Every structure is written in C-alpha cells, then in structure tokens.
Amino acid sequence: TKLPLIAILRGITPDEALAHVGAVIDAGFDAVEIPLNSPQWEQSIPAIVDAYGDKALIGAGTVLKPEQVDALARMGCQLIVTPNIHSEVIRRAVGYGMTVCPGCATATEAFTALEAGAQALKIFPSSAFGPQYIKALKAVLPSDIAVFAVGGVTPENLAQWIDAGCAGAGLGSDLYRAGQSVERTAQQAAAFVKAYREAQKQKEQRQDQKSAYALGASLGRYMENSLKEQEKLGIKLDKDQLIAGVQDAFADKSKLSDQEIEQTLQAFEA
C-alpha cells in the first residue's frame, strides 16, 4: 500500500466509523483497521469495507480466534492485525488471501509467525523495546519482511522507527482514542502523514548524501594510489595543489583553462 501507516481505531462505535475513517483516508492513509474489542465491530467493519474498501486497505485488529477470521472474510476484510502470534489465525487469514500483520515481541515469536505464512510483522508494543530492538531483529529476519512498529509511536518519533528499519507503523491511541472528535482524527492523521513524508524525505536525502559522499573517497584513493605510482618514478606532486585543482574546478574557478589542463597532462605524461 502507498503509505505504510495503519490507522488503528480502537473503541470506535458504528455511528462514528464512517466519518473518522473518511478523515484518516482524506489525510493520506490507505490502511485502516478496527480492533475486535471495539463496540459493535460487526456493524462498523462491514460498513467501512463498503464505503472505503476500494480506497484503502480495510480490516480488523485484535483478532484472537480462527472463527473471527472466517466472519471477517465474509464481511470483506482485507487486512488482519493481531497483538499476538497464533499460527492458525495467521494461516487462516493467509488462506483467504488477506493481508496479515501479526504481533510478536521476540525473535522466536517472529519466526513462528513467518512459518505460519506472515509476510509482514508487527512489533508490539514497540515502545518498551525501542528502535534498536527492531534494528537488532532486522539483522536476523529475511530481508523482504516488512516490520511495523506499533505501540507508543508518535509523529515526533516516527522518524526513528523508520531509520531503525521499520517499513511503517500502526498508530493507535496517539491517532485515535475512543470519543475524540472527527477534527482531532483529521489533525493527528495529517501530523503522521507529514511526519512520515517529511521523515521519509529526510531519509531519502540522507541516502542521496551518502551515495554522493563515497564517490569522493574512491576518487581520493585513486589519486593517492596514482601518486605512490608516480613517486616510484621519482615524481613527487604537491598535494595541496592537487586538492586545490579539484576544488577550484568543481567550483568553476579553475586557474587553468580546459585546454591548459589537457596540454599540461599530456606534458606530464612525457
């Protein structure tokens, strides 16, 4: 899904479901789930599937029993989120072609979830463990498994989860608490989308910077090694001038013309 953020609306009621979901989707979310410990979820969920199922990944959270998966499939749920690893829940949801993001907290639990067919993992609650926990888990997890931080993720700290290796995050109480206004939902959802996109943008910029940055090193080493080659032929080049040439030319202020540079190098060959 386009943006890797899951809106988790725990305790939302059927009469408010459409408005709050419309808020989060309008702000940029394209995954939403309603926990099964929300009141009258079997009214809210099929309603949101029908209004928004073709606009966002719609599903359910706190899915604890195989028989709930069956009921949710019939309702048109596309997404199953859990707080725990329960192999048959995962296998059953996978069996319906639904997207499953089950919750684990340890290495052992993560590999159990993968063996049940999970293609993504929720680390829950992430807040107790921290970004470094995920970084540590990512050193043993298969490369293509998407990891989602859930639990105490804020628009302020989202950056650090993404930096640590999270593909995205599930946002609960910090996005929606039962009985808050639709306006508050639109505000928090805007904040998270901004934080992701701003944070994601920062990460991309950092990656670009890093990519630029080494280039220099490889050329610096190239030169260093060429000098050592020259030294063995009895040629010892002034090192500061060499760097000054690189800088000046790069800044469009070379004291030599392109023609000069070229005839000088030819003369140097000789």
Catalytic residues: 33, 122
Supply the minimum distance, in Å, between the C-beta of residue 125 and its own copies.
4
Does residue 172 have a known ligand-binding role? yes
When binding is defined by CB under 8 A, the residue of 83, 155, 168, 170 that contacts its own copies is: 83
Residues 6+ apart with CB under 8 A from 15: none
- Binding window for its own copies (CB under 8 A); candidates: 92-100, 177-185, 192-200, 259-267: 259-267
Cα separation, 270 vs 266, in Å, equals 7
Cα separation, 3 vs 55, in Å, equals 13
Q: Residue 10, CB half-sphere, CA atoms under 13 Å: how many?
A: 15
Residue 60 lies near its own copies (rule: CB under 8 A)? no
Supply the minimum distance, in Å, between the C-beta of residue 218 and its own copies.
5
Cis-peptide into 125, omega within 30 deg: yes
Residues 6+ apart with CB under 8 A from 203: 159, 162, 163
Does residue 234 have a known ligand-binding role? no
Provide the CA 241 distance to its chain's centre, in angstroms.
45
Residue 96 lies near its own copies (rule: CB under 8 A)? no
Number of residues this chain uses to bind its own copies (CB under 8 A): 71
- Binding window for its own copies (CB under 8 A); candidates: 20-28, 123-131, 149-157, 160-168: 123-131
Supply the minimum distance, in Å, between the C-beta of residue 240 and its own copies.
9
When binding is defined by CB under 8 A, the residue of 29, 41, 52, 124 that contacts its own copies is: 124
The string over 26-50, giving b where at least 16 C-beta atoms fall within 10 Å of a residue's C-beta and e elsewhere, is ebbbbbbbbbbebeebbebbbbbbe
Residue 40, by phi and psi: left (phi above 0), alpha (psi -120 to 50) or beta?
left
Supply the minimum distance, in Å, between the C-beta of residue 192 and its own copies.
26
String of DSSP letters for 39-97: TTHHHHHHHHHHHHTTTSEEEEE---SHHHHHHHHHTT--EEE-SS--HHHHHHHHHTT
Residue 203 lies near its own copies (rule: CB under 8 A)? no
Does residue 62 have a known ligand-binding role? yes
Residue 231 lies near its own copies (rule: CB under 8 A)? no
In the region spanning residues 150 to 189, those forming contacts with its own copies, defined by CB under 8 A, are: none
Residue 40 lies near its own copies (rule: CB under 8 A)? no
Residue 128 lies near its own copies (rule: CB under 8 A)? yes
Supply the minimum distance, in Å, between the C-beta of residue 6 and its own copies.
16
- Enter the DSSP assignment of 152: S
When binding is defined by CB under 8 A, the residue of 104, 164, 169, 191 that contacts its own copies is: 104
What residues form the annotated binding site?
Answer: 10, 62, 122, 152, 172-173
